[PDB]
């Protein structure tokens, strides 16, 4: 995982840093509630920052969890960490996703914090909840924020309240009344967004139009989802969704007719300040999978993408968000965008943004978790044109130097033809780096401009193809990246099919 690329700008210990930087809580021992690439990038990013600040890569100790599997396969993440605690094997609910387990190990060590990144319990509000109730910090939003955010039903009411365009759904039109105190959606208004039976489901279904999606809020992970295309199928489809994720609330939402998928990168401290770090473009997908990703998103006019940025920050500030998160939008060929959801966690394609904005996200996460306020994070100060170590307040809303992304990035999701994660090296192109977890992986390419970004990524995939387990699986990526349609960044993405 890439960590990036006279006075004394260093302290002697976490303690001094917390004190010196307006911090309010010292975290020097962290438990990583995850494994694989997530566990690797978390350590690498933080340790890079630890070295820059303490001239000691180990200043922030790490304790990881190891299932009898990862352990036997010799996952690299195991020897990297400072301490590791062996955990039960089997599905994640017996480990990396078992919340009681995490807080239990978190308490016994003890650590001052936990990081889960993405996957597993990363989005389960009961984790930060149980952690705080035992005085263990969380490198992610507080349970209140995720609560106040809720599932799609709740968050959509909130986007709507804040007047953010949304796709027509069973809850279209619902809002709540809106100094402090985060927003909350009444249990009664929430139910007005669901559907209890085929009777009322069909009702709303007619008001929305076909085709549409039948989705269970508790659903997710390939479950609790269906595509209704006619009133003659709604009944069986709706009952299908019921039998798959029983008891779950269900809602309907219009099926977006092939548009762009844009993301906004949010970063917020524990004081009310939240900023955007440009966004990502992930309109290229192969069967519900983000294959190729861009950064920033150029497809959309800076004026319109900047507005999405503001709404996103608004949305975040309202739920009292903390740390990093993603707000997904749906930009249309003409100029219409709709809020889709907010990711209460860091994503795997984050290195894109780290690359165009020079921000070490996991390190930001850790400093915010110690109470350091945005204007006191070196990476942000620099991004805002300020002093690397000044104490000066930064006006994020109306900055004197509106940050500009440095370059363009391309990200490709790759697949194969001891260890769990393999770091990739390229003698060919030099603005590319990647990893491969053994199954899937990612490659990140930097370029002075989009052209060079695409170019480099390609020359890299080719070097990649020399590898045995990569003689075919990445061929279509190269062909795809070289297609003229992609070359000119056509607003239309249809061409992805007849490839």
In this structure, what CATH number is given to the domain that contains residue 230?
3.30.1490.20
Q: Is the domain of 275 the same as that of 374? A: yes
Tell me how far the alpha carbon of residue 73 is from its chain's centroid.
Answer: 28
Q: Which residues are annotated as a binding site for Mn(2+)?
A: 328, 341, 343
Say how far apart CA 268 and CA 368 lie, in whole Å.
8
- For the chain, the residue count is 499
Say how far apart CA 277 and CA 324 lie, in whole Å.
10
Cβ atoms of 437 and 37 within 8 Å: the answer is yes
Helix or strand or coil: residue 445? strand
Say how far apart CA 67 and CA 70 lie, in whole Å.
6
- Give the H/E segment covering residue 482: helix 475-482
Cβ atoms of 12 and 366 within 8 Å: the answer is no
Say how far apart CA 361 and CA 42 lie, in whole Å.
9
DSSP state of 61: E
Note down the domain range covering 93.
1-151
Cβ atoms of 492 and 333 within 8 Å: the answer is yes
Dihedral of CA 337/340/344/348: which sign? negative
62 beta partners: 30
Helix or strand or coil: residue 421? strand
CATH code of residue 174: 3.90.1770.10
Q: Is the domain of 325 the same as that of 444? A: yes
Which residues touch 196 (CB under 8 Å, ≥6 apart)?
A: none
Q: Is the domain of 462 the same as that of 347? A: yes
Cβ atoms of 60 and 366 within 8 Å: the answer is yes
Resolution (A): 2.6
Cβ atoms of 65 and 377 within 8 Å: the answer is no
CA angle, 268 then 431 then 264, to 5°: 25
Q: Is the domain of 106 the same as that of 203? A: no
* Elucidated via: X-ray
Report the number of secondary-structure helices (H) and strands (E) in the chain. Answer: 18, 17
Which residues touch 260 (CB under 8 Å, ≥6 apart)?
A: 281, 283, 297, 299, 300, 330, 331, 332, 333, 491, 493
Q: Is the domain of 185 the same as that of 206? A: no
Q: Is the domain of 333 the same as that of 306? A: yes
Q: Is the domain of 127 the same as that of 38? A: yes
Which residues touch 466 (CB under 8 Å, ≥6 apart)?
A: none
Buried b (16+ CB within 10 A) or exposed e, 126-165: ebbbbbeeeebbbbbbbbbbbbbbbbbbbbbbbbbbbebe
Helix or strand or coil: residue 427? coil
Say how far apart CA 261 and CA 241 lie, in whole Å.
25
Q: What's the token pair of residue 139?
A: 């490198």
Helix or strand or coil: residue 158? helix
Helix or strand or coil: residue 74? coil
Helix or strand or coil: residue 490? coil
Cis peptide before 110 (omega within 30 of 0): yes
Query: Which residue is it, tokens 């949304």?
Result: 166
Q: Which residues are annotated as a binding site for ATP?
A: 219-224
Q: Which residues are annotated as a binding site for Mg(2+)?
A: 328, 341, 343
Say how far apart CA 191 and CA 38 lie, in whole Å.
36
Say how far apart CA 413 and CA 441 lie, in whole Å.
6
Percentage helix, strand, coil for the chain under 3-state DSSP, each rounded to 5: 35, 20, 45
Say how far apart CA 266 and CA 281 lie, in whole Å.
15
260 beta partners: 331
* Residue 445 phi, psi dihedral angles, 5° rounding: -115, 130
Which residues touch 437 (CB under 8 Å, ≥6 apart)?
A: 36, 37, 420, 421, 422
- Alpha carbons within 13 A on the beta-carbon side of 107: 13
Query: Which residue is it, tokens 């599997």?
Result: 69
Q: Which residues are annotated as a binding site?
A: 219-224, 328, 341, 343
Count up the domains in the chain and report the number.
4
Strand ranges across the sheet with 212-216? 225-228, 212-216, 250-254
Write the Ramachandran bin of 57: left for phi over 0, alpha for psi from -120 to 50, otherwise beta: alpha
CATH code of residue 459: 3.30.470.20
Helix or strand or coil: residue 253? strand
Q: What's the token pair of residue 312?
A: 């996103």
Helix or strand or coil: residue 387? coil
| Alpha helices, H only, 427-474 | 450-465
Say how far apart CA 380 and CA 252 lie, in whole Å.
40
Query: Which residue is it, tokens 């000044």?
Result: 390
Q: Is the domain of 244 the same as that of 103? A: no
Q: What's the token pair of residue 163?
A: 């007047």
Cβ atoms of 329 and 338 within 8 Å: the answer is yes
Q: Is the domain of 270 the same as that of 294? A: yes
Cβ atoms of 296 and 279 within 8 Å: the answer is yes
Say how far apart CA 378 and CA 362 lie, in whole Å.
14
Q: Is the domain of 436 the same as that of 425? A: yes
User: 197-202 contacts: CB < 8 A, separation 24 or more?
Assistant: 198/234, 198/235, 198/238, 198/239, 201/170, 201/234, 201/238, 201/250, 201/252, 202/231, 202/234, 202/235
Cβ atoms of 370 and 112 within 8 Å: the answer is no
Helix or strand or coil: residue 310? helix
Say how far apart CA 362 and CA 323 lie, in whole Å.
9
DSSP output for 85-126: EE---SSGGGTTT-HHHHHHHHHHTT-SEEE--SSGGGG-TH
Respond yes or no: is residue 471 known to be catalytic: no
Cis peptide before 296 (omega within 30 of 0): yes
- Per the residue annotation, which of 44, 345, 376, 381 is the catalytic one? 345
Write the Ramachandran bin of 194: left for phi over 0, alpha for psi from -120 to 50, otherwise beta: beta
Instruction: Please return the burial class of 235, using the count of CB atoms within 10 Å of its CB with bins 0-12, 13-18 and 19+.
Output: middle
Q: Is the domain of 201 the same as that of 147? A: no
Q: Which residues of 300-431 form beta strands (DSSP E)?
A: 323-331, 339-343, 408-415, 421-424
End-of-domain residue from the set 162, 178, 193: 193
Say how far apart CA 246 and CA 223 lie, in whole Å.
11
Q: Is the domain of 486 the same as that of 382? A: yes
Which residues touch 320 (CB under 8 Å, ≥6 apart)?
A: 142, 144, 145, 148, 182
């Amino acid at each position: 995982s890439m960590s990036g690329l006279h006075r004394d700008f260093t302290v002697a210990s976490p303690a001094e840093f917390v004190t010196r930087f307006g911090g309010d809580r010292v975290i020097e021992k962290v438990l990583i509630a995850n494994n694989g690439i997530a566990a690797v990038k978390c350590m690498r990013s933080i340790r890079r920052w630890a070295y820059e600040m303490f001239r000691n890569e180990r200043a922030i100790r790490f304790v990881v969890m190891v299932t009898p599997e990862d352990l036997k396969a010799n996952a690299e993440y195991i020897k990297m960490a400072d301490h590791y605690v062996p955990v039960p094997g089997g599905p994640n609910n017996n480990n990396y996703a078992n919340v009681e387990l995490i807080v239990d190990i978190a308490k016994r060590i003890p650590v001052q914090a936990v990081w889960a990144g993405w996957g597993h319990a990363s989005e389960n509000p009961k984790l930060p909840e149980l952690l705080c109730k035992n005085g263990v910090a969380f490198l992610g939003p507080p349970s209140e924020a995720m609560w106040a955010l809720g599932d799609k039903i709740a968050s959509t009411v909130v986007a709507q309240t804040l007047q953010v365009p949304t796709l027509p759904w069973s809850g279209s039109g619902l809002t709540v009344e809106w100094q402090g105190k985060r927003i909350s959606v009444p249990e009664d208004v929430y139910d007005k967004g669901c559907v209890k039976d085929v009777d009322e489901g069909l009702e709303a279904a007619e008001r929305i139009g076909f085709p549409l999606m039948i989705k269970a809020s508790e659903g997710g992970g390939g479950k609790g989802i269906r595509k209704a295309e006619s009133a003659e199928d709604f009944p069986i489809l709706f009952r299908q969704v019921q039998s798959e994720i029983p008891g779950s609330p269900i809602f309907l939402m219009k099926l977006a007719q092939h548009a762009r998928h844009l993301e906004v990168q949010i970063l917020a401290d524990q004081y009310g300040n939240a900023v955007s770090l440009f966004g990502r473009d992930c309109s290229i997908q192969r069967r519900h999978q983000k294959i190729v990703e861009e950064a920033p998103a150029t497809i959309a006019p800076l004026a319109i993408f900047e507005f999405m940025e503001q709404c996103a920050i608004r949305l975040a500030k309202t739920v009292g968000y903390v740390s990093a998160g993603t707000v997904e939008y749906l930009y249309s060929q003409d100029g219409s965008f709709h809020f889709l959801e907010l990711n209460p966690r860091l994503q795997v394609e984050h290195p894109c943004t780290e690359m165009i904005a020079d921000v070490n996200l996991p390190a930001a996460q850790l400093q915010i978790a110690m109470g350091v306020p945005l204007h006191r994070l070196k990476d942000i100060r620099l991004l805002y044109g300020e002093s690397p170590w000044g104490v000066t307040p930064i006006s994020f809303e109306t900055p004197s130097n509106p940050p500009l992304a440095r370059g363009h990035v391309i990200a490709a999701r790759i697949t194969s033809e001891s260890g769990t994660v393999q770091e990739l090296n390229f003698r060919s192109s030099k603005n590319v780096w990647g990893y491969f977890s053994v199954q899937f992986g990612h490659c990140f390419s930097w370029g002075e401009n989009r052209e060079e970004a695409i170019s480099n990524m390609v020359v890299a995939l080719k070097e990649l193809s020399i590898r045995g387990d990569f003689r075919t699986t990445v061929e279509y990526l190269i062909n795809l990246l070289e297609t003229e349609s992609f070359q000119n960044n056509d607003i239309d993405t249809g061409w992805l099919d007849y490839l």
